[PDB]
Symmetry: C3
Subunit: 264 residues, 3 copies
Amino acid sequence: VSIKKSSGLNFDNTAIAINAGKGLEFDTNTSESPDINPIKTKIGSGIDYNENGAMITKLGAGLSFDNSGAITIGNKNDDKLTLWTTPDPSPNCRIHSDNDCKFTLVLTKCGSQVLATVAALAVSGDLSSMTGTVASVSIFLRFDQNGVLMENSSLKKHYWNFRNGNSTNANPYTNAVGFMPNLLAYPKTQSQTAKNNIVSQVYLHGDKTKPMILTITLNGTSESTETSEVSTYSMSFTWSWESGKYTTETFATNSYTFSYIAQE
Amino acid sequence: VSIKKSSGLNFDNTAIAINAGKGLEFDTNTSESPDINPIKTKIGSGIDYNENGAMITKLGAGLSFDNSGAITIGNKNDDKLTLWTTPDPSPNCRIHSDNDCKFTLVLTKCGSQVLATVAALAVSGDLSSMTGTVASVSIFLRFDQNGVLMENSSLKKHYWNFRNGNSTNANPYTNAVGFMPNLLAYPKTQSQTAKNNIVSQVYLHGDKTKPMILTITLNGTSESTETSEVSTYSMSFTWSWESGKYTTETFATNSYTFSYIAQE
Amino acid sequence: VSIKKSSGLNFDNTAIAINAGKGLEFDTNTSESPDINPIKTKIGSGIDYNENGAMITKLGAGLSFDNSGAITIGNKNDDKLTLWTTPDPSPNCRIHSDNDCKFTLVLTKCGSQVLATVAALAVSGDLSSMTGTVASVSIFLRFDQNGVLMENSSLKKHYWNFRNGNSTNANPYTNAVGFMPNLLAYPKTQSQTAKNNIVSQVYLHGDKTKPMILTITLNGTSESTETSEVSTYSMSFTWSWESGKYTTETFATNSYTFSYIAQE
């Protein structure tokens, strides 16, 4: 028996056998091993086996296959690079009384930063009924060390979750630290550090004659320190204006875009 | 004829054969088949073969090969994650009269949101010659149910397509739904719902003494309801100021950044 | 000897050999080659070999493996899709005198655009001590043809690098053109082209009563034309307010979000 060792064949005690090297190996966990030890590919990270025994790239969060079977950015329904209240939230927030507001917030992770958009809409009355001697509105979000929404927030927990189409995951998320405001950039503190805020002039109902100041706070003064409810990450949105004004108006803001350094 | 079956080979009808396992198969599509089938690799979604027969990961939109043969994000040339008018557009928009303005708009898909940058430059004359009794400028985009720009838009159709280097795709796109404003978040309506708008104070020619208000509208009020030309998605840009101002000025805005929840 | 050609084996002049097809080849580099060449997988771009000899997807910038070993978007210990000064810079910038300011700037690549966040803080005195009939503060970044920070810049070179956790890359970056402002969209010019800037009203210390104008310049008039130090790309941040105001105040800004079209 003459073999061509120059092409993957060799001996083992004068017994012919295919000399497999890289990317190749023998399936040890065969029903007939060592007798029947079929040769197969040696895979690792990023690759997996199809139900049909075919090798495929194992895709994770953020990726998916297109039509030609190529890998593209984007997710097949489930999307964990987006944390939100859903694009069209039912009353889900409290400003002065329970469920008096529809709060909209979409956090999209873009690596070291989070791109966000926000909008609020009262659904129980005019400003005068939600403020008192106050000429401001405040919506706050407190998160534990895992990025999980805490009870002492203005937003109801049920529909604050990762994206799933135009809705959210049926199951509550357990970790979103990648969406939290970076603690080195925005430390926890009682002192209002300029860098912790994003301050702009906005307009009630988009009306130029009805200006307001929107102040967004990352950690810092928006952190909860109450006994038993100390938050690690936090973020609040405050709208202020000249006392006496808009008393009869209905609180309704225009969508607002902003971004911040992420914790990880 | 001694075969150590523990190493890939086997005995089929007293004939030495290769016992192929996971990730390996026999090419039954060779000129000389099924009598002579070589051993090829078993591959599925995410994997392909180049001309040299080597295995490579099949990349789609958003991904590309690093000069080190690594998979990285981004397509310097053909890029389906960017719908724009090119960065250096020629007279391509109509404010008052044909081609009287250069309109620059870049929509960059960031998953659940679209990050965008906009700028406009009149190239035919001063504000007076483009408004009339109106102290404002409007640029609107109408899209069919597939995200294709409709005839009833201020922007011309030729150079509004997916990115390719610093220019556009040669072939007109047929779907950009993932770039369209989310209908649940921004419904089509005859009503000025605050959330459908983004409103900020901008400055003409970047001069602090020449303030203007910029109202970007998503769907809703910017939708086209005209018989035969009813849009599904739309966005408009309106710049307004005190009537009787900047009559001899050239309309030139600074670059503005905003983002919005995408349809998908 | 009989052989089953329909199963990967063939005859080369009476020599039994394995008929290698797509995705396979013979390792002709072994210590025993060119005679005892084992059979191995033919690999190309996107794929690499484990130390264990297994096949794995070769991941580059922007990608990484998660728990289940799947390919996911995101990079912790090395993110070349983020060029920053680190989230918590020590004095690292010069406004009037050396190290008199903590300049924070994060540039995150989002395909065709760079998403950015900026914030500055003086750490040596008040506004009067940094101005003098000025009524403004400027911070400029000049870059060479590779996107490498130049000497005639306000920011110290040391900690302006790609991201690594909450710090920077141990090694100085040699190319970041991908983070530079597009030259076609924002040309180099002694002329103040409206589109080259981004202008907004901000507030000192987030105090509604202490407004300022923030002018960001992409290339254009921010480019250095000095002999021997002629920048290719550049960006500047200029804060101006009404003369005579805020002389005893310390310069502190709120975080500012903005974006621009990238060079590549």
